[PDB]
């Protein structure tokens, strides 16, 4: 997260870190045994780390739970990045408390101008490397489809939307993918891609979770 702030002043209990010997992507706890993330975060085995603030220090609220099932969207496209979403079934149920809890699925699509909270352990620099130990947060608004399309002509599918600032300066970045965009207590977006990070006229592109609610519910039911 470039241009954000330390989440220690906020409650972000649905944020998870996906670990393969190190943090490589975020995710969102949507059920006691299921996480939503990005399809480009797929690995054949993933350890989900819940209850984290500082990913380098044991603080005492962590749960580390390995994936039992990892299900990339079947129509994920590795060139166009369409259908950039994945579900992870935990091998055991997360214990729900103040530090680890679920985020509601969206009941209606992203709304232009709504302020949303984006979070993650991604790069905090637009050039070079500045990766944080502590979870970062950014408040950013949903942008209109016209602005999203003008920023990325021909590259925005119906399953994508932009959140951020056309002036640049604040954005999600490498290490944030898979993590949450939450608007009014609902998970609206999965951090996906962009042209770099925090560049003028290049806001981040996010997967529209609302377009996948039936896929998510069906997948959970079929794997329970």
């Amino acid at each position: 997260i470039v241009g954000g702030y330390n989440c220690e002043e906020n409650s972000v209990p649905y944020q998870v870190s996906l670990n393969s010997g190190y943090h490589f992507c975020g995710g969102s706890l949507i059920n006691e045994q299921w996480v939503v993330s990005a399809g480009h975060c797929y690995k054949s085995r993933i350890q989900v780390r819940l209850g984290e603030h500082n990913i380098e220090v044991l603080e005492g609220n962590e749960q580390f739970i390995n994936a039992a099932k990892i299900i990339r969207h079947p129509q994920y496209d590795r060139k166009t990045l369409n259908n950039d979403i994945m579900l992870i079934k935990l091998s055991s149920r997360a214990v729900i408390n103040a530090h680890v809890s679920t985020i509601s699925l969206p009941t209606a699509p992203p709304a232009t101008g709504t302020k949303c909270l984006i979070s993650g352990w991604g790069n905090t620099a637009s050039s070079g490397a500045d990766y944080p130990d502590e979870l970062q947060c950014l408040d950013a608004p949903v942008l209109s489809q016209a602005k999203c399309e003008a920023s990325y002509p021909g590259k925005i599918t119906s399953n994508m939307f932009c959140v951020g600032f056309l002036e640049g300066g604040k954005d999600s970045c490498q290490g944030d993918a898979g993590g949450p965009v939450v608007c009014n207590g609902q998970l609206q977006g999965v951090v996906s891609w962009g042209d770099g990070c925090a560049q003028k006229n290049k806001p981040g592109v996010y997967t529209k979770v609302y377009n996948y609610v039936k896929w998510i519910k069906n997948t959970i039911a079929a794997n329970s």
Binding site: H23, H40, C41, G122, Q174, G175, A177, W193
Partner: protein, 58 residues
Amino acid sequence: RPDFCLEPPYTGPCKARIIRYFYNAKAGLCQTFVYGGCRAKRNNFKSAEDCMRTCGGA
């Protein structure tokens, strides 16, 4: 060694932080870099061993 071994590493537009290896030809070694998760070029290896076998003559 393949000519793709001489190209600079490519993070791409996706926003993961996946640690991959690339061959640094002048340094004669494989080095780590951040790969974003999509649109990989060929000088991008999941391990040092894969990188050295392909570009380092191992």
